[PDB]
Design a protein around this ligand. Structure first.
Ligand SMILES: [Zn+2]
Lengths: 83, 130
């Protein structure tokens, strides 16, 4: 259900990224847990920088972040989203 | 002593856009003068309550907050500490940490802002190392 990227539809993953970007949690601990989860799921070498320290040119809206993840995984031999 | 009430004191220092960049270097970054102006004389039940107030004031400050991205702005608006760059993170410590320059163990002041610094996890661990 939330063990890997392949367990998430793209819409479900967008929900997760949106919650993080809006800091929509009841505590700092809850937000850190979600960001760590995101890092483990994406396997992207930038880690939390995708959310907080975007590369010049990158779209750091929740939708932008999802597309950066989707494109990186597609280009680097990784499995993609469920449906 | 971190859990006994105190009023915040001290002046802080002028800062610029590189304020949080300084948190990864030397003794860390100072508390900004503008923040000290807002928090001086307020009573806090604990140091954690003070920490929350620091980040809330950062969220509201037009010069300090402009140098955070939208997701980090959301974080500070909740009173959370913002996330540091990846290479300054250490394990589950991923956000800026408040540090006492003269240690509390040695009679350092808990709520005097001139005794407080903003650090990254990596720099905070290194300062305490010895
Ligand atoms: Zn310290």
């Amino acid at each position: 259900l939330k063990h890997s990227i392949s367990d998430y539809t793209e819409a479900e993953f967008l929900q997760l990224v949106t919650t993080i970007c809006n800091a929509d949690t009841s505590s700092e601990e809850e937000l850190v847990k979600l960001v760590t989860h995101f890092e483990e799921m994406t396997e992207h070498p930038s880690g939390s920088a995708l959310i907080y320290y975007p590369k010049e040119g990158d779209d750091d809206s929740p939708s932008g972040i999802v597309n950066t993840v989707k494109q990186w995984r597609a280009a680097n031999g990784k499995s993609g989203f469920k449906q | 002593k971190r859990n006994k009430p105190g009023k915040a004191t001290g002046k802080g220092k002028p800062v610029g856009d590189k304020w949080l960049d300084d948190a990864g270097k030397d003794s860390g970054a100072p508390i900004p003068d503008r923040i000290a102006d807002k928090l001086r004389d307020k009573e806090f039940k604990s140091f954690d309550d003070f920490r929350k107030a620091v980040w809330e004031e950062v969220s509201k400050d037009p010069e300090l907050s402009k140098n955070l991205n939208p997701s980090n702005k959301s974080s500070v608006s909740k009173g959370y500490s913002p996330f540091t760059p990846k290479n300054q993170q250490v394990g589950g410590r991923k956000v800026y940490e408040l540090h006492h320059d003269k240690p509390i163990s040695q009679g350092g002041e808990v709520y005097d802002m001139d005794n407080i610094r903003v650090t990254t996890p990596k720099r905070h661990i290194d300062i305490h190392r010895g």
